[PDB]
Amino acid sequence: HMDPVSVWGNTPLATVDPEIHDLIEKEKRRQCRGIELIASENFTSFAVIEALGSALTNKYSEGMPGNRYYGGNEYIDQIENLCRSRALQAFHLDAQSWGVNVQPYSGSPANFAAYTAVLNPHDRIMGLDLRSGGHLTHGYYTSGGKKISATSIYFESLPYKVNSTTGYIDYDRLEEKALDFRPKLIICGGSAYPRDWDYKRFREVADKCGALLLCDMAHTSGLVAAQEVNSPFEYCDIVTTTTHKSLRGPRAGMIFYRKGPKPPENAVYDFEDKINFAVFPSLQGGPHNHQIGALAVALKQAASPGFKAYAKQVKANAVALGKYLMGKGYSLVTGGTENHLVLWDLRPLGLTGYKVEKLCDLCNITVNKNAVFGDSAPGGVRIGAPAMTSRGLVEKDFEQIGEFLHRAVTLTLEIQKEHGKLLKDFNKGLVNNKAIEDLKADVEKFSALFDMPGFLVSEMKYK
Amino acid sequence: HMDPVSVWGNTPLATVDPEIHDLIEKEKRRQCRGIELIASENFTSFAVIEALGSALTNKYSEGMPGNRYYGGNEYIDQIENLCRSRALQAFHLDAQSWGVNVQPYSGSPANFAAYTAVLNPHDRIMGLDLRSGGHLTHGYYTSGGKKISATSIYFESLPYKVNSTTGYIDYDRLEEKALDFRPKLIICGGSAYPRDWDYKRFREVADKCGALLLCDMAHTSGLVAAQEVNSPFEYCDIVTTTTHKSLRGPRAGMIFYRKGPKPPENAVYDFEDKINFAVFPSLQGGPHNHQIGALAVALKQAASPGFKAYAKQVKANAVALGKYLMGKGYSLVTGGTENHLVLWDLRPLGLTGYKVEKLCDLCNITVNKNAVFGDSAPGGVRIGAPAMTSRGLVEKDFEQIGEFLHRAVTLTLEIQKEHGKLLKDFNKGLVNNKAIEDLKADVEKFSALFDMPGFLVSEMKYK
Amino acid sequence: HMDPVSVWGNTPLATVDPEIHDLIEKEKRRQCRGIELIASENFTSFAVIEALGSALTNKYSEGMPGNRYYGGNEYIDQIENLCRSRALQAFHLDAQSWGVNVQPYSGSPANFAAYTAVLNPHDRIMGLDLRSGGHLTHGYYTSGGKKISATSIYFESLPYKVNSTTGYIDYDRLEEKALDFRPKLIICGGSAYPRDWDYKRFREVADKCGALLLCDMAHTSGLVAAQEVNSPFEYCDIVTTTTHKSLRGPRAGMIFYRKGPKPPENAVYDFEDKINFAVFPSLQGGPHNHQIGALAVALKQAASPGFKAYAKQVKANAVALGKYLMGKGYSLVTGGTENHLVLWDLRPLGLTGYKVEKLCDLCNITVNKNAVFGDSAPGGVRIGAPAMTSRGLVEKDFEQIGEFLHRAVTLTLEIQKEHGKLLKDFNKGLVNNKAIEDLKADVEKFSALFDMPGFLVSEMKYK
Amino acid sequence: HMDPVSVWGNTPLATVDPEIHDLIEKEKRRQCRGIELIASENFTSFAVIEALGSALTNKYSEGMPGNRYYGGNEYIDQIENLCRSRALQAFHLDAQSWGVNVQPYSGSPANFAAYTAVLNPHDRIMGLDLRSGGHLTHGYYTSGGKKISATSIYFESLPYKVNSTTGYIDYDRLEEKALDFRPKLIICGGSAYPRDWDYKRFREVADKCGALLLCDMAHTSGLVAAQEVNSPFEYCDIVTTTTHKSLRGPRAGMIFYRKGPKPPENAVYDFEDKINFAVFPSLQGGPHNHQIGALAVALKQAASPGFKAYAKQVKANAVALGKYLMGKGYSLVTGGTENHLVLWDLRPLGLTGYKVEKLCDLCNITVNKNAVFGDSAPGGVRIGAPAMTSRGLVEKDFEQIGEFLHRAVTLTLEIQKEHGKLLKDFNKGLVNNKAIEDLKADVEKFSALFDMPGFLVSEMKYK
């Protein structure tokens, strides 16, 4: 009574699962009929999507290429080798001095595997405070001492912060902190920091306290590949990353690590085996070979002249957006940007990030509420350029986005003035708001004028 | 100088990345021109592959449906809700008594998140010993006390084993062990156990020592959904699983957990919030929404009449294979099977699992070497039925596979007799071996006669 | 308005503190007007007591002799050196192969310092189960997994047990257990085991699993010094001890450790520095120099011909007592003794250890209730020979003690027969019991016939 | 062949052990023929010494009074109860609000037992940095991250420091540190801090971060009993102490803890049972009953009018010494004292603490080298008043001690000027130094003029 392979196995999704097919179509329209400003998002290529959705998902290949536990790995080995060699090329790394492991399921597993490789349970870690622009996997506990991040459950973490008035990393306090706490590992990189990192200074702090130094470059890895921001590879021991943000690839993770002789015992680096062993067999099972193939595709694309121009454009778009906002009287943390995002301090407007985020989301403008230096109800919004830049928007287009944001914050203030400063009141002013429906229509019309990678808009089920 | 969206973003893989496209094509041919007997593998549907390779990879949706940190989740919420409700339906679970989290990136992250949710660092865990058929994520350290599994790095594990002479789980020693070691969590389920599990007895042991009881049903989850083996849901607190083995879905993980009133304070279960919080924000970042959509598809497919028939066929095929092997004088661990695999003890033949695995791999027969009870160089091979059954093979076809295995072990013995019992010698007998080249040709001819899900063979680049 | 030094500082205790002086006098009478059978007790010499109560208590001398943090240590150094060299002599240890640290405040700190020296937090330890005759500092958690012993809080312990029917250590289960659990440290020695230890076998088990081996010889250290039981020094890495039980010294602890070349890298032992550093500065402050002086005295006394004869007598007295008990139909665990104690199984009499202990304590016979193999309300009493042997009792005197115990258990049964088997009932039968008052008078009369070390009975305040 | 009880057991030390007896006599002379300025030392009463050296050492009494595991404790219970009730009286504590455990073997075991009672392994602790005047048991690791203190091995510690320029505790940095690190326990009290503690402010910091607050009052407990410094009992949850420094008792420890209703659930304090259980059975075995009797004596003595006058004198003597030093141009940390010690900063003289300590020790002046705020070879000496004040020295006598110190530092400078600033050179100037031999003779003559508690100088073997 078994179904024929043609019926269950070869039939397209639109017949097998209409419900899911319909929902994907609506998500496809949503992605191209709004303004996507989530700084951790991007629209990847169709080529990447074709590798991701391939028979590569069927192959179970525990181990490394050339040291696998089962047979039949002739072509999976070649894909993984190509993915690794392309990873080194994309970041201009000499293979004698750097290795990479491309099996992490995602960025957060890449981080935790890196920790497991070089630390023992309860070893001390320092990372950029969440409220200062850091990331959950770098450590996070609450004021009640509740350990939220797994990094803070299995290791002992302590955050360093930005200067309270300037919004830049306080390198003097970082150093004083590291000399007190004596971390075995210092993490640099972050999720909502709008400036570049002084990796040289991090290296100096690390050397002074006897720490390893790791960069989580998840957010800016695309800018790093195109050499548009400082490279962490010059000064860090280990570099982890996600592959889907500014790098514009699939959802995956990578761990880069130093190889060969150490700088001034005639000693050599010892990370390669520990890192690989941490990924498998300690933490992961078989790799997601479709992710590795998709990632190999993304890495080749990342090494093209067009990608360096894209990374330049991402930077120029964020700058032109920020300058447009500041021209309207708005205040940005650090007063500008050097990367892909702006951090908009709304406290001078009497507004909360949540209120602006909610109203923007009603106009199909997706940003995210975000903490700002000394927040104690986050008081800012975080806006990123990668996704809309991938759709071909240039500086003039990002100035229009700034106008849309300007219109949106204006509607937020008019609501707050009319209905009240309490969240209960603010909501009353959204109901049947003509002005909100008008901005929504303009956003959708503006959004619809640009192209869209990954799927053909002239094949969409909803237009 | 940016590339047009059409050039980099809409162009097919075969133009963007010829190398990777070619390698995927060869892997596609390899998958249908050999005999795939790795018990942890399957060939998933094309519908699953279409959801997996979709614009769903572009959406970042940290949190749970209805409690997300960013906007634009209208359709992702609906996909995740449908995936969860289908997960409960597929395993015949009342929603008032069971919840499920579908965000784990894979099976090994699902396990570790479950541990994190209910245990503190260094809590004691018991699982099926690796050499007795268990899995790395259930705990593993070596005789030198080297902690291999992350489960054994961050927690205190102790394995229980099968009876040395029968190959069945020794439930008496399990109970004596648990009463001595007092684990906070007992794990059941395994990777290479050929019999069903007595979950009732596990529950009795767990109750006697005050332990939680978790089933990792990764290998048999398809059989569990079709109610062809014992359900762990009747007796376990938590059930984790991978979704790509006998379940025939994408690579993903799920964590099921009890809800509602406890059995005999009028107390209720407390797993839902801990489990969800452990997945996010403690360990993972944003979910892989394309995996969740693909998984939702697989779960609907798993709930069809054809899937119950497929699970019945998997069981019948493994049994008919085992009986064919034993009819040739071969010995199976426990003398048969009740699930999807057979475990073939090669020590009575004077052979090592590696030697049979190597020669089978030369004939495009992929099995894996596997330990057998008291091994001290694994002495068996593990053979599974799910993948070839997905291609439509029935019992007569699995008897022919048994003949191919019989021919292969015969060629292995002829080599060992001629060239020697040392691994160095065995290899000498592979070079330009006509007889090996003949079995390979028969395997490829037999393999080519069957259909193949996930991609159309009449569109293959290599035929 | 300060008191003159003569008034507060030179005045005797009997004037400064009549209350405390009176209470010490009553304790002195109690010690010599009853029968002391607590196996962990002894009556030390007056010489030991004079060193203990000396100006040595005034000196603070952090560090080791020859490496102190402060001046004025000329004579404290010499006392500590003499105490250490006498410690090696007392146990017939070559100084090139063994070192000793004499600063532990007591036996339990000596154990914990030894653990700290050679283990990391959460390392695995195995020791003799409490219910099988072991000691709390070797590890103890309850059936609910509550960690009682600090050894079980800061380290991971697992107990091994005696055979359930014979009462001897089950060396086969010990080995099977150690190969499963892989402890970093195995502890031998115990508090209520009546037989000698097979240290050679412990060494074999330890070598097979890669464990350190430590003996806690607190109870039998006097017998060890006199070479009347097996020496742990032949086979263990570390030997800890208390100094006041069968060794007949002050309350103090010592840690012995191997030095010099290892047995078959041309490697040497590495315990000396770790051990010393663990005692100070990790765990302890300045040593109790009066204890070290008293201990030096006890060690010289322990090296006299009279002490070897005393240790022989202790053994002969316990044997003659046990034989007297068994002649009356009583049952001893293992059916006898090879050391200083007997373990009396009262379950064949229908009696609990508590009931016999309580009634004996009413007749000034101090024993202690004690678990027996498989107890699930301890079912035995533990009786030791050191204290009464120190008062000069020989075999005939210990046969009379056996008669007193025999009379006491007879009164316990007569009470249980008349009033009932519930603890509530048993108590009713103690009130104004003539027969109990008669045994008490005979015990006190018999007790008063012997001499008493440490203080002059003909100077007692209460006679 | 056993020795008679009279021979080994009643014979005095001077016959049993001439070596040890002779060495104690020389230590007795050393104690009264020099100037003892070690701040952690005292000369206790003869009454204390008589209880310490008594048959109380023979009794093994595991448990608490009224809940013991063995019989024969009638009089030991009464001694322990009296010792506890006297402990509460001595510190003016209401029994309904405070309990005390008097079994800790010493101060360092009292601290670790307190930690064990209220913390889990790896909980965070903050204490006064060693270099700022704190104590090893409050936490200590080196710049290489080597964990020295057991407090830093089993728990996670972070030190707070004194202000770099004033030498007072930096309460602002303490609070900022505690809000970052979130310790579960903050420790106050120290070994070389010359000022009082603002426990109210510590309580404020503790409340703000959700921490327990513990005072280790080992050094100043005598001053605390006499109400001559701030009481930690007003604001701390737990108070530990040693009993032999300014308290002038035996070597022992105590743990005080709050009882009864908490200040603003109608909740009550929960320390009593945890504290008692941590002492026994978790960490310690049977208590040292002779210490408890001696301590009971010391506590009664501590509650006399003469003791309050003695504590006043200690404070006045340290002040008069400090003023004398500063009158000679010397510099003290914080410019004076409020307690029993002065901390003398020698860096303005171009001298190291070791050099002054070494030369003082050659003149029978025992001080100890000590770190000073920001030291990076300690640069100070720590001098304490309790011991010499116990011999009856008043302010005029401490001015003469200041002159002796002045003469000694003068001889140190003359040596450094003649022979050199390298330690190698300084030593050359000690050989056959007439001037050093002259100060030694004056110190011994001055020292001999005063009385001496604990033993009669007119019975000394060496005069």
Contact B282, A140 (CB under 8 A): no
Contact C233, C91 (CB under 8 A): yes
Structure tokens at B28: 């596609």
Contact A390, A417 (CB under 8 A): no
Which residue in chain C is spatially nearest to B207 when comparing CA positions? C144
- Which H/E stretch holds residue D99? strand D98-101
Structure tokens at A28: 């496809």
Say how far apart CA C375 and CA C373 lie, in whole Å: 6
Q: Looking at the complex, does the CB of residue B268 fall below 8 Å from at least one CB of chain A?
A: no
The architecture of the domain spanning D308-448 is Alpha-Beta Complex (3.90)
Q: How far is CA D60 from CA A148, C50, C418, D63, D287, in A?
A: 48, 20, 34, 10, 7
Say how far apart CA A127 and CA A129 lie, in whole Å: 6
Structure tokens at A164: 């309270």
Say how far apart CA D200 and CA C296 lie, in whole Å: 47
For A154, other C-beta atoms within 10 Å of its C-beta total 24
**Inter-chain contact D76–C251, Cβ cutoff 8 Å?**
no
Category of B296 on φ-ψ map: left (φ > 0), alpha (ψ -120 to 50) or beta? alpha
Say how far apart CA C456 and CA D11 lie, in whole Å: 10
Contact B274, B224 (CB under 8 A): no
**Helix and strand element counts for chain B (H, E):** 18, 15
Q: How far is CA A363 from CA A40, A49, B321, C406, in A?
A: 20, 28, 61, 95
Question: Which of D44, D69, D366 lies closest to C57 in CB terms?
Answer: D44
Nearest-10 Cα torsion for B233, B237, B240, B243? 20
B251 among known catalytic residues: yes
The phi and psi torsions of B369 (rounded to 5 degrees) equal -55, 150
Place of tokens 């059941």: B188
Say how far apart CA B247 and CA B221 lie, in whole Å: 6
- List the strands of the sheet with A156-160, edge to edge: A98-101, A253-258, A238-242, A212-216, A185-188, A124-128, A156-160
Say how far apart CA C117 and CA B27 lie, in whole Å: 56
The phi and psi torsions of C347 (rounded to 5 degrees) equal -50, -40
C440 among known catalytic residues: no
**Inter-chain contact A38–B54, Cβ cutoff 8 Å?**
no
Q: Looking at the complex, does the CB of residue B80 fall below 8 Å from at least one CB of chain A?
A: no
Experimental method: X-ray
Q: Could you give the 3-state DSSP secondary structure of residue C172?
A: helix
Peptide bond into D378 cis (omega under 30): no
H helices of D33-93, in order, are 46-52, 74-90
DSSP state of A250: -
Structure tokens at B417: 């007799």
Q: How far is CA A344 from CA A352, B35, C272, C344, in A?
A: 11, 59, 62, 81
List, as one string, the DSSP characters of A278-335.
IIIIII--S--HHHHHHHHHHHHHHTSHHHHHHHHHHHHHHHHHHHHHHHTT-EEGGG
Say how far apart CA D218 and CA D109 lie, in whole Å: 12
- Find the largest Cα–Cα distance for chain C: 73
**Inter-chain contact B122–C156, Cβ cutoff 8 Å?**
yes
Q: Using only C-alpha atoms, what is the Rg of chain C?
A: 23
Q: Could you give the 3-state DSSP secondary structure of residue D68?
A: strand
List, as one string, the DSSP characters of C220-274.
THHHHHTT-S--GGGT-SEEEEESSSTT---S-EEEEEE-SBPP----B---HHH
Say how far apart CA A290 and CA A57 lie, in whole Å: 5
Place of tokens 């963007």: B16
Contact A157, D156 (CB under 8 A): no
CA atoms within 13 A on the CB side of A330: 26
Say how far apart CA D325 and CA D348 lie, in whole Å: 13
Question: Where in the sequence numbering do the catalytic residues of D fall?
Answer: 60, 62, 216, 242, 245, 251
Structure tokens at C363: 């007749």
Name every chain D residue with its beta carbon within 8 A of the beta carbon of A177: 180
3-state helix, strand, coil in chain D (%, to 5): 50, 15, 40
The phi and psi torsions of B134 (rounded to 5 degrees) equal -80, -170
Structure tokens at C100: 């000793």
Nearest chain C CA: its distance from B351 CA (Å): 28
Say how far apart CA C422 and CA C427 lie, in whole Å: 9
The phi and psi torsions of D444 (rounded to 5 degrees) equal -65, -40
**Inter-chain contact B82–A19, Cβ cutoff 8 Å?**
yes
Nearest chain B CA: its distance from A24 CA (Å): 7
**Inter-chain contact B8–A150, Cβ cutoff 8 Å?**
no
- Cβ neighbors of B151 (< 8 A, separation 6 or more) are B111, B112, B115, B125, B127, B136, B137, B138, B139, B140, B157
Q: Using only C-alpha atoms, what is the Rg of chain A?
A: 23
For A458, other C-beta atoms within 10 Å of its C-beta total 6
Contact C56, D43 (CB under 8 A): no
Place of tokens 């985020």: A357
- Cβ neighbors of C327 (< 8 A, separation 6 or more) are none
Considering only CA atoms, which of A33, A35, A39, A43 is closest in space to residue A344? A39
Say how far apart CA D70 and CA C361 lie, in whole Å: 9
Place of tokens 């392979």: A5
Q: Looking at the complex, does the CB of residue A145 fall below 8 Å from at least one CB of chain D?
A: yes
CATH topology of domain A313-447: Aspartate Aminotransferase, domain 1 (3.90.1150)
Structure tokens at D457: 């100088």
Burial level of D366, CB count in 10 A (0-12/13-18/19+)? buried
**CA angle (B182 as vertex; B176, B184 as ends), nearest 5:** 130
Say how far apart CA B187 and CA B205 lie, in whole Å: 12
- Cβ neighbors of C81 (< 8 A, separation 6 or more) are C65
The phi and psi torsions of C365 (rounded to 5 degrees) equal -115, 110
Q: Could you give the 3-state DSSP secondary structure of residue D401?
A: helix
C253-258 and C238-242: which strand pairing?
antiparallel
Question: Where in the sequence numbering do the catalytic residues of A fall?
Answer: 60, 62, 216, 242, 245, 251
Contact B79, B291 (CB under 8 A): no
Q: What is the distance between the terminal CA atoms of chain C, rounded to a whole angstrom?
A: 41
Say how far apart CA D6 and CA C436 lie, in whole Å: 33
Structure tokens at A330: 């708005």
Q: Could you give the 3-state DSSP secondary structure of residue B283?
A: helix
Contact D55, C24 (CB under 8 A): yes
Considering only CA atoms, which of B261, B254, B250 is closest in space to residue B218? B254
Category of D93 on φ-ψ map: left (φ > 0), alpha (ψ -120 to 50) or beta? beta
Say how far apart CA D345 and CA A344 lie, in whole Å: 52
- Cβ neighbors of A105 (< 8 A, separation 6 or more) are A252, A253, A284, A288, A291, B105, B106, B109, B288
C195 among known catalytic residues: no
Burial level of C450, CB count in 10 A (0-12/13-18/19+)? middle
Category of C76 on φ-ψ map: left (φ > 0), alpha (ψ -120 to 50) or beta? alpha
Q: Looking at the complex, does the CB of residue D144 fall below 8 Å from at least one CB of chain A?
A: yes
Q: How far is CA B209 from CA A16, C267, D157, in A?
A: 47, 45, 35
CATH of C55-302, one of 3.40.640.10, 3.10.20.600, 3.40.50.720, 3.40.50.300: 3.40.640.10
List, as one string, the DSSP characters of A384-426.
E-HHHHHTT--HHHHHHHHHHHHHHHHHHHHHHHHH-SSHHHH
Residues of A (84-143) whose Cβ lies below 8 Å from B: 105-109, 112, 116, 121, 136-137, 140
Contact B201, B213 (CB under 8 A): no
Say how far apart CA D210 and CA A90 lie, in whole Å: 48
Burial level of A337, CB count in 10 A (0-12/13-18/19+)? buried
Per-domain boundaries in chain D: 55-302, 308-448
**Inter-chain contact B30–A296, Cβ cutoff 8 Å?**
no
B185-188 and B124-128: which strand pairing?
parallel
Question: Which of C143, C156, C210 lies closest to B144 in CB terms?
Answer: C210
Nearest-10 Cα torsion for D30, D31, D35, D36? 130
CATH of B305-448, one of 3.40.470.10, 3.90.1150.10, 3.20.20.70, 3.20.20.80: 3.90.1150.10
C62 among known catalytic residues: yes
List, as one string, the DSSP characters of D81-92.
HHHHHHHHHHTT
For C394, other C-beta atoms within 10 Å of its C-beta total 14
Q: Looking at the complex, does the CB of residue C454 fall below 8 Å from at least one CB of chain D?
A: yes
Please name the amino acid found at residue B250: P
Peptide bond into C281 cis (omega under 30): yes
**Inter-chain contact C158–B145, Cβ cutoff 8 Å?**
no
CA B411 to chain centre: 30
- Cβ neighbors of D270 (< 8 A, separation 6 or more) are none
**Inter-chain contact D158–A181, Cβ cutoff 8 Å?**
yes
Contact A337, A168 (CB under 8 A): no
- Which H/E stretch holds residue B171? helix B171-181
- Cβ neighbors of A300 (< 8 A, separation 6 or more) are A86, B16, B17, B20
Name every chain A residue with its beta carbon within 8 A of the beta carbon of B452: 5, 9
Contact A125, A185 (CB under 8 A): yes
Considering only CA atoms, which of A26, A3, A29 is closest in space to residue A16? A3
Contact B356, B380 (CB under 8 A): no
Say how far apart CA D207 and CA D117 lie, in whole Å: 20
Say how far apart CA D148 and CA B63 lie, in whole Å: 43
- Find the largest Cα–Cα distance for chain B: 73
Q: How far is CA A371 from CA A167, B68, D137, in A?
A: 12, 16, 40
Contact B158, B152 (CB under 8 A): no
Structure tokens at A305: 């002249």
Question: Most C CBs within 10 Å: which of B125, B131, B141, B143, as the mutation test of the C interface?
Answer: B143
